[PDB]
Every structure is written in C-alpha cells, then in structure tokens.
C-alpha cells in the first residue's frame, strides 16, 4: 500500500535533515488495543527474518561476558577457527566489574556495537554494565547458550563449550531482529537499516515481523501480541512516527 511511500519520504529526509544525519537504524513501533501482560524483563526475545538477512556477524563488534573461571570459555572459542575471527573480546563477569567501572562504561558503549552474554550470568549484568545500555534496545545484552546440554535436578553441571553451535547462534542472532516485551502496548522493533538494503527489503521485513508477532500459535516466543494490532508506525531513532496499517 502506502508503506513504500512512507519509507520513501523517511529515507529522503534522513539524508537531508541536519538533525537526522546520524541515526542509521529504522524502527517500527506497535501500539495495540489491549495491554500485553508480561512486564519488561531484560532478556531480548529474537525473531527470524525468513527471506532477507539483516547483518552478517563479521561487521559488528561483539563483546561476550562469560562465567568467572573463563579459561576454556576463552580458550576454545579463540582457537577453533569457526569463531576465531568472530568475537571481538571475551571478558569474565568478575573481571568486567573490576576493570570497567565509572565513566569507562560510556566508551565501552561507544566502541562496541553489540553485547551478548551467556544465560548463566545475564541476570547479574545490569548492576555491573550500567544504565546507559538500558536506555532502549540498541545495546541491550542478547542471549547465547554455551553447552547445548541441559541440567536436571541435583545433577552436576558438566562444563562444555561447543564453538560451532554458538557461532550458529550468533549467525542466527545477527541475521535478524529482536523484541523486548513490555507492560503497556507500545513496543518497538528495529527492522532494517538505511544503507544495508532498500525499500522492498524493509517492506517484507515489516511483513515477516507482523506475521510472527501476531501468530496465535507458537506461544512462548511468538504469541505476545494478542487480539489485533491497532497500528504500526515506522520511525528512526529521532524522526517522527509515520503511520501505516490504520486498522
């Protein structure tokens, strides 16, 4: 419909408006009628993009926060040659708290373009990594598994790090976008980029996003928006919310 026209005027002004010269990410926001009941945690649920990959993982600075011993977490992923040219720097959580503290979290925010941590110590993160990261979802810390094996009740944790399968996760997590569920209706997803691709690529990125978010089946990662979407609004991080899908 007019979604191509709305993206056309947004692309035209963002290289022309002096205020919008710096924001390079494109967001669609979703306001629903009912409020989805799950409050805002800090684990970002990711969604796939079935046709067009967003980013390949060899153009983003990737910081990994691992467990406290961190010997074979560092050793295996650096000397496997599946992930050797992938990770930028690996830090243990106790060493991250001790080394990077104060105003150095700002330069850690600016220099490193994406942050991901294991499921072990991700909940401990926001009191050592700072409130600058939790201003929206630009550098919200993403999710990776480490072992591809589970822990039952009273079973000893067997430590294993398979680099191929955690490389495939970073392939599966940089190729697409993610949503963070919220208490109120307004949630925003970052679909596409200004110069990575163009308007027909963003248009089917919109369609695959609203297909996954409105899926009445596939509950725990997809069944978040219930009923129907009232509207969707395409925007940059500093532009206005241009309207599409009025009803």
């Amino acid at each position: 419909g007019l979604a191509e026209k709305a993206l056309k005027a947004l692309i035209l002004q963002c290289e022309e408006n002096p205020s919008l010269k710096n924001d390079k990410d494109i967001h669609i926001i979703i306001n629903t009628g009912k409020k989805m009941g799950i409050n805002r945690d800090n684990i970002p649920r990711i969604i796939p993009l079935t046709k067009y990959k967003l980013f390949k993982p060899r153009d983003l600075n990737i910081l990994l926060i691992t467990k406290d011993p961190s010997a074979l977490y560092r050793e295996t992923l650096t000397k496997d040659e599946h992930t050797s040219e992938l990770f930028k720097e690996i830090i243990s959580v106790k060493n991250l708290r001790r080394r990077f503290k104060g105003s150095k979290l700002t330069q850690l925010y600016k220099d490193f373009d994406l942050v991901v941590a294991d499921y072990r110590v991700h909940h401990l993160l926001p009191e050592v990594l700072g409130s600058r990261f939790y201003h929206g979802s630009k550098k919200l810390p993403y999710m990776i598994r480490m072992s591809k094996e589970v822990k039952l009740k009273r079973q000893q944790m067997v430590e294993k790090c398979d680099p191929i399968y955690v490389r495939a996760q970073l392939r599966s997590i940089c190729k697409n976008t993610s949503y963070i569920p919220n208490n109120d209706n307004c949630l925003s997803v970052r679909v596409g980029y200004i110069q990575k691709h163009s308007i027909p690529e963003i248009l089917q990125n919109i369609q695959d996003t609203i297909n996954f978010l409105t899926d009445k089946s596939k509950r725990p990662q997809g069944g978040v928006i219930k009923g129907g979407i009232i509207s969707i609004f395409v925007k940059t991080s500093n532009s206005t919310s241009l309207p599409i899908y009025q009803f």
């Binding site: 945690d41 796939p48 495939a168 970073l170 392939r171 725990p220």
Partner: protein, 63 residues
C-alpha cells in the same frame, strides 16, 4: 426390509453413540495400560525466551 433395518439402526446409533469414547479413545487406553501395568532450565526461567533458533543456513554459511 427398510422399515425393520432402520429401527435396528436407530437402536444401534442410540447405544454406540452413548457407550463409546471418541475423543477419549487415546487417553482412556493409555491410562488403562498404566493402571493394569525448546529447552527448559531448572534454575533460570529465561532460557526459552531469548535463545536464537539455529537453522541450517546458520551452520553452513561461512560468511
């Protein structure tokens, strides 16, 4: 013979519909055999929301 056979079919549909288990044909047979004889973490409840669905292209594309 249509008059007598319809009355037999009427009594047959009266019993067979009211003395069966259509949707319970599986559960009442599995429980009768027991009577006669997405990864989930234990301690972190945020395992299944945030994990990336690994596809075959993510295991193959060396790029």
């Amino acid at each position: 013979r249509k008059y007598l056979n319809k009355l037999i079919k009427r009594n047959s549909q009266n019993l067979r519909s009211w003395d069966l288990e259509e949707e319970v044909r599986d559960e009442l047979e599995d429980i009768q055999q027991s009577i006669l004889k997405f990864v989930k973490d234990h301690r972190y409840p945020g395992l299944t929301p945030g994990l990336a669905p690994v596809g075959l292209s993510d295991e193959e594309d060396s790029s």
